[PDB]
């Protein structure tokens, strides 16, 4: 009937977290990136981001209808109060979740870690990304497991800006031999408007407005025909 506001917000966060985990374990092969809920009067619209949408809807939305049915019958919303959409993401080649899933599904079928891993690092770099770091840890065969990491560009670690400039995705890829952990960190580039980069710049970068060339005569003398 009614629960305290702290409990209400904690439960809403739990709703978001478990929904995110549920459709992460559902459609990671669909290039899922993230899920966002929208506050609407007495309704809860949910919009879901995936690299591919024709697959997530499929034919006549069998997958979409299955997902909405299971979410409705799991979460206890009133009949037909939960509806999930599917819209593409403008930032696909530098989103940590998308590239982590790409690495996992290039590494699952059996492939040299380095070729696919450098390929995804490239596809990150030509997507305008400012810097990337990928680490693959686990069995490189033998009695010892190792970690190999490839970095490119500039990427920061410490301070506040790592919160809103670097996104990191940690995933497990299950090989018939073992489990390989992939950690993919990307720093977005600064670009105001469009929501493609963080609004604020790096807080140690001082920008200066550039004057233009000025080669002028001694005195401005009016000229008429």
């Amino acid at each position: 009937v009614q629960i305290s506001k702290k409990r209400k917000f904690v439960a809403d966060g739990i709703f978001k977290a478990e929904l995110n985990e549920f459709l992460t374990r559902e459609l990671a092969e669909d290039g899922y990136s993230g899920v966002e809920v929208r506050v609407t009067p007495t309704r809860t619209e949910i919009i879901i981001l995936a690299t591919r949408t024709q697959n997530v809807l499929g034919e006549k939305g069998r997958r979409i209808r299955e997902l909405t049915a299971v979410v409705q019958k799991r979460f206890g919303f009133p009949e037909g109060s939960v509806e999930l959409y599917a819209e593409k993401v403008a930032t696909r080649g530098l989103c940590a979740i998308a590239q982590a899933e790409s690495l996992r599904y290039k590494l699952l079928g059996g492939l040299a870690v380095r070729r696919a891993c450098y390929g995804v690092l490239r596809f990150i770099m030509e997507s305008g990304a400012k810097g990337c770091e990928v680490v693959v840890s686990g069995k490189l065969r033998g009695q010892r497991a190792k970690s190999m990491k490839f970095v490119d560009g500039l990427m920061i670690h410490s301070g506040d800006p790592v919160n809103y400039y670097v996104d990191t995705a940690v995933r497990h890829v299950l090989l018939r031999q073992g489990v390989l952990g992939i950690k993919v960190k990307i720093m977005l580039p600064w670009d105001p408007t469009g929501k493609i980069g963080p609004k604020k710049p790096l807080p140690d970068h001082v920008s200066i407005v550039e004057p233009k060339d000025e080669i002028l005569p001694t005195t401005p003398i009016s000229e008429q025909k």
């Binding site: 040299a112 870690v113 380095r114 490189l140 033998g142 010892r144 190792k146």
Partner: peptide, 26 residues
């Protein structure tokens, strides 16, 4: 070629060291 590079750089001095280096270009 990539698989040989990975095997070599995993254990550059272990049991699978001479064979991988030979297999690289020979």
């Amino acid at each position: 070629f990539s698989e040989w590079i990975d095997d070599l750089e995993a254990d550059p001095k272990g049991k699978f060291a001479q064979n991988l280096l030979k297999k690289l270009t020979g």
